[PDB]
Amino acid sequence: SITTWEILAVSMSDKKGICVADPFEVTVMQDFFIDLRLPYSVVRNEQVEIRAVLYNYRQNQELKVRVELLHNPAFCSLATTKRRHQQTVTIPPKSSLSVPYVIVPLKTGLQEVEVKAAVYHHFISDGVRKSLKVVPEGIRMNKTVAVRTLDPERLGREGVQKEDIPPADLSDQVPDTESETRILLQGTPVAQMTEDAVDAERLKHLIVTPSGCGEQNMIGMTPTVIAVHYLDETEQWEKFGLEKRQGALELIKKGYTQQLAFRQPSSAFAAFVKRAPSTWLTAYVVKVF
Amino acid sequence: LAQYQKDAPDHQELNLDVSLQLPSRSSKITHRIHWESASLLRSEETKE
Amino acid sequence: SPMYSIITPNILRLESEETMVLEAHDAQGDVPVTVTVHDFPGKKLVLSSEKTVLTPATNHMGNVTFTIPANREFKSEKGRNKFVTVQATFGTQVVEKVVLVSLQSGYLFIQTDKTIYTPGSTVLYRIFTVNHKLLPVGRTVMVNIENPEGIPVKQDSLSSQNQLGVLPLSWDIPELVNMGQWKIRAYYENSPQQVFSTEFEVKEYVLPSFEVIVEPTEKFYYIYNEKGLEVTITARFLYGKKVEGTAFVIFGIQDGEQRISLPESLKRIPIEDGSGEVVLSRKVLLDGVQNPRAEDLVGKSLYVSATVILHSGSDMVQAERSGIPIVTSPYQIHFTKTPKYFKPGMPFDLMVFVTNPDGSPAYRVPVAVQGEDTVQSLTQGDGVAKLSINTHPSQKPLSITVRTKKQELSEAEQATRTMQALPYSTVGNSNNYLHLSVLRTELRPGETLNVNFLLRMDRAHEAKIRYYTYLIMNKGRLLKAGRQVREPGQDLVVLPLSITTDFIPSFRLVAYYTLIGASGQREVVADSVWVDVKDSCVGSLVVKSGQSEDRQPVPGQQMTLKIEGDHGARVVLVAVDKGVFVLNKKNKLTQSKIWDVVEKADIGCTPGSGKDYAGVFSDAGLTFTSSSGQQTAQRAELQCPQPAA
Amino acid sequence: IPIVTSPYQIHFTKTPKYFKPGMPFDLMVFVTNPDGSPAYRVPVAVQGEDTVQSLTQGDGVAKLSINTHPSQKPLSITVRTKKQELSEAEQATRTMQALPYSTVGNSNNYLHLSVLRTELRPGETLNVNFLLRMDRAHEAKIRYYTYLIMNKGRLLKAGRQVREPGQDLVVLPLSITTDFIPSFRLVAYYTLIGASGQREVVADSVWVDVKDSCV
Ligand SMILES: *[C@@H]1O[C@H](CO)[C@@H](O[C@@H]2O[C@H](CO)[C@@H](O)[C@H](O)[C@H]2NC(C)=O)[C@H](O)[C@H]1NC(C)=O
Ligand SMILES: *[C@@H]1O[C@H](CO)[C@@H](O[C@@H]2O[C@H](CO)[C@@H](O)[C@H](O)[C@H]2NC(C)=O)[C@H](O)[C@H]1NC(C)=O
Ligand SMILES: *[C@@H]1O[C@H](CO)[C@@H](O[C@@H]2O[C@H](CO)[C@@H](O)[C@H](O)[C@H]2NC(C)=O)[C@H](O)[C@H]1NC(C)=O
Known part of the structure; x- marks a missing residue:
């Protein structure tokens, strides 16, 4: 191909990291050449025009060119094996000349087209062989077969559901052509069933320092212990303050250390060690702990 | 209110096991749908 | 203790x-x-x-x-x-x-x-x-x-x-x-x-054989220009030779996401010597719009669409230039690299970021403070100008307004921007500050940078300051930290910092001191600044030609590709025709966009300073916590807070 | 073509030979190739402490600095290059001795100037920094500075820079024009009646190189 190429280079170093280099440009060129500019696709069995452009970049020399379209079994033209389709043209210097040809596509697919040209009194020549798609007449259609709901509890009864998809009837289909069937599945996103929790605005007061007797230490430790667990599961430490969970952790640890000081030697609890042990308070600490 | 959250109720209960029986039928395409794939698309293409 | x-x-x-x-x-x-x-x-x-x-x-x-x-x-x-x-x-x-x-x-x-x-x-x-x-x-x-x-x-x-x-x-x-x-x-x-x-x-598609460039003389339009917007056309073949043809070009207006086309803006010019030129006059643009006010045209943008065909008539390229702003001002002034927090009674530095209307940086434009015409400076290569004020000990916020002074341009063409900076709050209003000052240059790896630490406090407590503590934040992680010692009487000390390839593309320096002052109270005073580094590779991969002659080689010819690069590196290659890029040059990856993605992932939100020592660290992207109790502000959001704009 | 042990030549030619006691001091080290052409991007370091290192700029100048003590004794300064692969016999070195500033009546009241070190082109701005050092009883008496510019053997520009109390540091931007080519000197001073009622003058100066080009 005659153009300027742009080369992109990216390096990967285990110590110097990724580096995307500056693009390097290489201009590939010949002084005399052809560029056959085909369409991407052509309708089969309809006569079309191809445009072959021939370029002359001498600064003071016009050139006599014999240009020829070659015979093709897949494309009908004036070029046959006995009789060739050739012309004799003249290209002025620092200019380009376009030579039209007319052809007819004969068979479907990506078929071959070839042209050549050579100049008189110099031995510089060029040939261009490209392929272009011969498409049968017709157009793309993306119709929908079916759109239906799946629910095995609701449809088919008792958690089992069977459902068929017939193929498309497509009587307008072009003969011997591809036909994809795109199947898609997407679940149903169901949400909510959650009520609003308490916004933790007025819950900032329940941090109480434990103090006093064993029951009184349990009174002061009572709102501090439950509030951390509520704010853990409601994750409202963003509004409340992340520093206050560590501060409450010291008060919960201080409450437990003070709670073990009123422990009876038979693993029981009361306000004092002199007092007879309380059955209800023993059950309440087990609920708290 | 903590036990109301923590393991809070939610409308999702997806546990779908869907399988297809192909025209080529060399294998049965089978996928699963749960909560992490609730809004996930699953697509397959044929050539016929 | x-x-x-x-x-x-x-x-x-x-x-x-x-x-x-x-x-x-x-x-x-x-x-x-x-x-x-x-x-x-x-x-x-x-x-x-x-x-x-x-x-x-x-x-x-x-x-x-x-x-x-x-x-x-x-x-x-x-x-x-x-x-x-x-x-x-x-x-x-x-x-x-x-x-x-x-x-x-x-x-x-x-x-x-x-x-x-x-x-x-x-x-x-x-x-x-x-x-x-x-x-x-x-x-x-x-x-x-x-x-x-x-x-x-x-x-x-x-x-x-x-x-x-x-x-x-x-x-x-x-x-x-x-x-x-x-x-x-x-x-x-x-x-x-x-x-x-x-x-x-x-x-x-099939690839074209030539490229069309649409070049506005200026990348904006000034509304009161009687001549109008001039757009130069350049067209050449892909191998680099001049295109002879005829161009059809039409103008249009873009308002938000919706485009409006001007039908009578169509002209027909031949493309000769690989070039052409077309002008949309001021009368045709005002005739195109149904609103005769020139004031409502400000804020919208223009677009150009051209269609060029060779004089052989065998190929055709459509090009587009878009996003051309209709503005009163050929420049845009921003305090985006300026800290919003000043030190009362200690001089303060201003880094003014000035751009062209498209967003490209403006080069060598003189700007000045609104207060006093004597303080003027010209922008550097990256569009940054250096100004400074001599601050009074005002505990009231200080409004700062900067206006350009570029010659020949009228006062309606001079851009301006107005902000309000905030005072630093010392611990207990002790008026003991830390001030940082540094050179403002384009930083390349291998250069040294002098960091200046100025102490401000009463001399009864200056003997208690024996060191500074500094840290370097780069790409969201701590790169270097240490101590800089200080002897008494040395309120200013200098630390040379050598730039390596790890500091690319931008880094923040923080510094602080600490003591027990006032009535026997622990005091922390901090300061920070953001520095831009020249965007370049950490390594250095270069691709060039091995041959030194045979310019424009023949199709199929063998040539030597020479690749200089870092030792131990793995390189990937792709060679593409440029005609693909003339069709669609979007989403091309480059090293500058890589550093742009890293800068968008930065956790620091402010170009230095802060409301206090805690605001200095929090805006830089750092957390601090001491055993005495002084610690940074809580942050529960990954993204940066949005400016009011 | 010189036959040498050292591929570089270190000179203190652009460094002042007089230091300010108890105030940090800047070193401008001029390094050349053996013919005399300036060396590019060679790292030099002070002999004392390996941590303070810096590489030369385009004009062969490297920036080093020390944090000076109030020694009234002269201070020896030795600079040595640290360029890799080269042996210690190949590392150039230079040794000088700087001299202490003498204040009026040993009052220890100084003026310190500091500035950026870049290649200066016309049209750029340059931040000049004025640091005052004195006791706070006389800091309220210093209300101004007096500056002058010497270029090509004549005074080019001069003026006053005012100062408010508590502002020991002030900054003055200087725009570079074509008149400053090829090199210029800035001087600055203040004055007051201090100590026991005696007139005192304290001054400081610096020499700046400008990029050689046409006016
Ligand atoms: C057939 O395919 C086309 C794509 O070729 C699809 O329709 C497109 O939908 C997008 C919006 O997502 C539009 O921007 C395009 O303009 C549509 N293309 C058209 C109208 O050609 C879609 O899959 C199918 N559409 C129809 C109309 O059959
Ligand atoms: C933190 O400690 C590490 C120790 O592993 C330091 O790494 C060494 O630093 C010294 C001096 O900078 C170098 O001479 C060594 O070569 C480093 N070690 C290795 C294995 O390369 C690191 O510099 C320290 N960082 C800070 C900020 O203090
Ligand atoms: C000394 O005085 C002369 C007066 O002739 C000053 O020249 C003028 O300076 C002002 C302000 O810089 C300019 O606006 C004028 O245009 C100058 N006059 C002319 C005729 O051009 C000169 O600047 C003063 N120099 C110093 C150092 O004070």
Whole structure:
């Protein structure tokens, strides 16, 4: 191909990291050449025009060119094996000349087209062989077969559901052509069933320092212990303050250390060690702990 | 209110096991749908 | 007693190294320090490694490192915030703090061989897998290819371990396809919520043989220009020779996302010597709009569409220039690189960012403060100008307005911007400050930079200041930290800092001192500044020609590709016709966009300074917590707060 | 073509030979190739402490600095290059001795100037920094500075820079024009009646190189 190429280079170093280099440009060129500019696709069995452009970049020399379209079994033209389709043209210097040809596509697919040209009194020549798609007449259609709901509890009864998809009837289909069937599945996103929790605005007061007797230490430790667990599961430490969970952790640890000081030697609890042990308070600490 | 959250109720209960029986039928395409794939698309293409 | 101190970033990342800086202040003798990382909330213990000893020979310093693993337990919550807890025990006194965690683990960059493809062709694509340090990492990547309406058609899962962070893969486009924009999306396995993407187009085309350039004389339009907007046309063949043809060009107006076309703006010019020129006059534009006010035209934008055909008539290229602003001002002034917090009674530096109306940086334009015409300065290469004021000890905010003074341009053409800076708050209004000052140049690796530390306090407490503590934040992690000692009477000290390749593209320096002053109270005063570094490769890959002669080689000829680069590096290649890029040059990856993605991932939000010592660290992106009790502000949001604009 | 042990030549030619006691001091080190052409991007360091290192700019000048103590004794300064692969016999070195400033009546009241070190082109701005050092009883008496510019053997520009109390540092931007080519000197001073009622003058100066080009 005659153009300027742009080369992109990216390096990967285990110590110097990724580096995307500056693009390097290489201009590939010949002084005399052809560029056959085909369409991407052509309708089969309809006569079309191809445009072959021939370029002359001498600064003071016009050139006599014999240009020829070659015979093709897949494309009908004036070029046959006995009789060739050739012309004799003249290209002025620092200019380009376009030579039209007319052809007819004969068979479907990506078929071959070839042209050549050579100049008189110099031995510089060029040939261009490209392929272009011969498409049968017709157009793309993306119709929908079916759109239906799946629910095995609701449809088919008792958690089992069977459902068929017939193929498309497509009587307008072009003969011997591809036909994809795109199947898609997407679940149903169901949400909510959650009520609003308490916004933790007025819950900032329940941090109480434990103090006093064993029951009184349990009174002061009572709102501090439950509030951390509520704010853990409601994750409202963003509004409340992340520093206050560590501060409450010291008060919960201080409450437990003070709670073990009123422990009876038979693993029981009361306000004092002199007092007879309380059955209800023993059950309440087990609920708290 | 903590036990109301923590393991809070939610409308999702997806546990779908869907399988297809192909025209080529060399294998049965089978996928699963749960909560992490609730809004996930699953697509397959044929050539016929 | 001595005060123990821990400094870490605001936000910690999964699957990457995290720097932990331990210091003790005013300390005597050795103190052992044990380090532990726990989860939040509760206690499951995620990391119990590392310990060190703060020594007076090392000025009670100690930097230790760790790495955060991620498992199925860590990756569980994907949508809402979660935190962890850092524990460091200084002798018998423990200091701990809850830290915000980001779930990001690195970067993914996707290169395609073309920006636009045909039905029935192959797409070649390489995925580069790097960590946060832009170094190749071996992880499992999940890649998906989606349709124009968002349907995944092909998906992959592969690890790049022992492949030097390169995943070369391929896929064929079917002929049964919907033309339009197609998207490739990718994410790491251990970070599913961080999604990377790049786009390409599918169309039915053949490549053109020439390119058309549409060049406005100025990349904006001034409304009261009687001549109007001049747009020069340049057209040449792809191998570099001049195009002879005839161009058809039409103008239009873009208001928001909606485009309006001006039909009578059409002209027909021949393209001679590879060039042409067309002018849209002021009368035709006002005749095109039905609103005769010139004031309502401000804020909207123009676009140009050209259609050029060769005089052989065998090829055709359509080009487009768009986004040309209709403005009263050929410049845009921003305080985006200026800190919003001044030091009362201590001079303050202004870094003024001036751009062209499209957004490109303006070069060598003189700007001045609105107060006093004597203080003027011209912009440097990156569009930054240096101004400064001599601040009074006003505890009231100080309004700063900057206006350009470029010659010949009228006062309606002079841009201006107005902001309001805020005073630094000292601890207990002690009026004891720290002021940083530094050179403002384009920084290349290998240069030295003089950092200046100015102390302001009463002389009864100046003898208690024996050191400064500095840290360097670069790319969201701590790169370097240390102490700079000070003898009495040396209110200014200088520290030379050598620039290496690790400092690219931008870094923040923080510095502080501490003492027990006033009525026997611990005081912390800090300062910070943001510095831009010239965007370049960490390495240096260059591609050039091996041959020195035979200019424009023949088709098919052998030539020598010469590749100079860093030793030990792996290089990937692709060679593309430029006619693909004339059709579609969007989404091309480059090194400047890589540093732009890293700068968009920065956790610092302000160009230095702050409302106090805590605001200095929080705006820079750092957390501090001391044993006495002074600590940074809580931050539970990963993103930066948005300016009022 | 010189036959040498050293591929570089270190000179203190652009460094002042007089230091300010107890105030940090700047070193401008001029390094050349053996013919005399300026060396590019060679790292030099002070002999005392390996931590303070810097590389030369385009004009062969490197920036080093020390944090000076109030020694009334002269201070020896030795600079040595640290360029890699080259042996210690190949590393150039130079040794000088700087001299202390003498204040009026040993009052220890100084003036310190500091400035950026870049290649200066016409049209750029240059921040000039004025640091005052004195006791606070006389800091309220210093209300102004007096500056002058010497270029090509004649005075080019001069003026006053006012100062408010508590503002020991002030900054003055200087725009570079074509008149400053090829090199110029800035002087600055203040004055007051201090100590026991005695007139005192304290001054400081610096020499700046400008990029050689046409006016
Ligand atoms: C058939 O395929 C086309 C794509 O070729 C699809 O319709 C497109 O929908 C997008 C919006 O997502 C529009 O931007 C395009 O203009 C549409 N294309 C058209 C109208 O050709 C869709 O899959 C199918 N559409 C129809 C109308 O059958
Ligand atoms: C933190 O400690 C590490 C110790 O591993 C330091 O790394 C060494 O630093 C010294 C001096 O900078 C170098 O001479 C060594 O070569 C480094 N070690 C290795 C293995 O390369 C690190 O510099 C320290 N960082 C801070 C900020 O204090
Ligand atoms: C000394 O006085 C002369 C007066 O002739 C000053 O020249 C003028 O300076 C002002 C302000 O710089 C300019 O606006 C004028 O245009 C100058 N006059 C002319 C005729 O051009 C000169 O600047 C003064 N120099 C100093 C050092 O004070």
